[PDB]
Amino acid sequence: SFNQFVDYTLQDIICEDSTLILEQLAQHTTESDNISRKYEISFGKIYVTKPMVNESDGVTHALYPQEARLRNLTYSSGLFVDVKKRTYEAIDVPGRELKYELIAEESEGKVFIGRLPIMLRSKNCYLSEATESDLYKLKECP
């Protein structure tokens, strides 16, 4: 269930509401500023890191479940999304339908959206690919 969630349902949740569009109308008292802007922030592919922990001083290092249990940390991994930034401008002529075009400011770019707690021995956890001797090295019970 957790492997299905992480593999597909996270991407499905991102892609249902991937795009977000805000229109700034001209609000033009004079016809010299008859332009309407359309700023779209679009989410794309989602990436999941290996389970990590950031310390106080900004040091981010790989977190193992024994260390998390000992130090009262959350055995979680970071979620990143691709964000691409479309911007459009149109000539705000009343009556005529607005036609938007890119100004080629299409910046895109993984950004951090939060930490997903990782259930142990799932495909994201370190203990899935570990052998029995590796579990003994990591002080985890086989």
Partner: peptide, 11 residues
């Protein structure tokens, strides 16, 4: 007086 910005539900 006109609202400057508004949300568009994508379709």
């Amino acid at each position: 007086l006109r609202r400057k910005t508004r949300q568009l539900k994508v379709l």
